[PDB]
Every structure is written in structure tokens, then in C-alpha cells.
Subunit: 64 residues, 6 copies
């Protein structure tokens, strides 16, 4: 899988990301944690984001 | 899984949440119970929310 | 599962429900029968509702 | 399953149906045949309808 | 399955089709090839169409 | 499968593609890498695109 390495880096370097949902809605923050079903995104509070409703995950700066 | 621990806390502390559906529609209330397929949300009546139609689950205050 | 107990009660007490589809469209009537894939809803005619296109199931009065 | 009995009757009595897709779009005609994945609907030509994109199947008259 | 026979005929007789995506968007051309996940459609270039995002496949003339 | 050969060619010849998401949104760039779940697309930064939210993959020039 490539998801695990990719999300690991955003989580590890605490890189600010834009997650865009399948309806265009745009969420912003830092990936607190993830599992195969969900991604937890942190701003004021931790929200649970369902991967099945995610279209793309967009880092806000280049990530090694 | 992380869903189970996360939804357990909202259910246990009866934390008011905003569930946003895959079409932007915004539901509000308290998680009465959940299973892998569905989430029951309580306001005036208990409604059955299908997880596959959920985009994100947003607590209304920080949850341990 | 919780779906089976929940839909059983709406079907058994013939409780009028609003099923809202993943596109916001709102259907109304009584649950005639269900299986894991579909829900049959009755008004003038019986229509077949695919669960995968259901977002939430909303009873029109409290159900034990 | 209930789908098989339900779609069998529409196909067998050649009952005119409205299939509404997950985007609201409304298709009309008669069910030529079906399998678990798809439904063939007939008007001027036979079109292939993917069940995963179907929200509900609405007969145009009561069906035994 | 019925998909395989149906798509085989459109591909074999090089029948011009309209594929309508789950968002209403309408694509046109000829089916170059298919597998269970995807359909390749040809116009100026070959594009890869994901079946999960297809609502219906509409031939532009009757197909045996 | 046909996806693997098709995406391999876009990735190998570094062919500029338009990926259109299930909500019409149009993304552009080059396929950096892929796995069965996701496609990484490169412009200014590498973004993670979920295949389940992809409708079609459109090369910007004929690809052998």
C-alpha cells in the first residue's frame, strides 16, 4: 500500500493538509492519526473523516 | 480500528456532535449507539444514519 | 447488527418514516419489508429503495 | 434476498417503472433483464443501468 | 453476469455509446476494451472510465 | 486487470493527465505512482487521489 507511507509522513511532520471531500467541501488541519477506514483531522477539535468520503489529500508544502 | 474508540467517547460522554453527510447536509445531536454499518443519532427522535453516507463526525467540544 | 432491530420496529409498528437519500431527496411512507441490500417503502405503490443510496432513516414519532 | 423477487415481477408483468439515479436523474421504461450488478432498461434502445447508481425503483402501478 | 455480454457487443460492433456518470456528466465514444473495474472509451484519446462512477451505458442504436 | 497497464503508461511516459472526480472537479498533472486504492498526482506538491472518488482518467495526448 502507498496510503500508509503517505499519510504517515503528513502525520509525522505535522504537515498542514487540505482534505477535499467527495462533494467539493474543503477541510483543513493536521492529521492526528489514521486507520484504513478513517482519518482524524485536528483543528479546534478532533473530527472523524471517513476515507470513503475523501476525494484527495493535499499537503500544503512538499513532503519527503 | 479507531472508529470504535472515537465513537465510544462521544457516546459515553454524551457529547453533542455535528455529522455532515456526503451531500453537505448537516445533522446535529447525540450518538445514542453505533455498529459498524450505522450510527443512531438522537434529537426529538432516534434516526438511523448510514456510515457510508457520512463524510465526517465533528464533536462540539474537545473530547478525551 | 442494529439495523435489523431498528427497521423491524418501524416495520412492526407501521411507523411513518422519512428516508432521505444521498442526494437530499426525501421519501416518505411505511417500511413494508427489508433485507440487507434494500428497503421496500409503501405509499400508493411499493418502491424499492437501495440502502446504499440511503443517508438516514427518520421515524416520525418516538419508537420503542 | 428481496431484490430478485421484486425485479422479477416488474420484468415478468412488463410493468413500466421509474428508476431514479443517485443524482436525481429519472429514467423510465421496462426492465428487460437483471443480474446482481446491473439492470437493463428498455425504451427505444436497451441501456445498461448500474445498480450501485440506483437510488430507488418505482413501479408505475401496484404489482403483486 | 450480463455486463460482459452487453459490453462485448458494444465493443465488437463498435457501437457509439453515451456513458452517463454518477454526476450527470455525459461521455460519448466507442468502447475500446473493458475489465470488471474499468471501461476504456475512445474519442481523440483513450480515457479510463471507472465503472463505479458510471450510472448507465446507453447505446446509440439497437444492438443485437 | 487493465488499470495497471493503463496507469503504468501514463506514469512511465510522464504523460500529463486530467483526472475528473465524481463531483466534476478537474485535476491536472502527472501520475507519480499508484496502488489499487490511490493515485498520487504531481504538480506543485504530491496529492493523494482516492480511486473511489475518480470518475475517469484522461490522457492529454495519445498513449501507446
Amino acid at each position: 500500500s502507498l496510503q500508509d507511507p503517505f499519510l504517515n509522513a503528513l502525520r509525522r511532520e505535522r504537515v498542514p493538509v487540505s482534505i477535499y471531500l467527495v462533494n467539493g467541501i474543503k477541510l483543513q488541519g493536521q492529521i492526528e492519526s489514521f486507520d484504513q477506514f478513517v482519518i482524524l483531522l485536528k483543528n479546534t477539535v478532533s473530527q472523524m473523516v471517513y476515507k470513503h468520503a475523501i476525494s484527495t489529500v493535499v499537503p500544503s508544502r512538499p513532503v519527503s
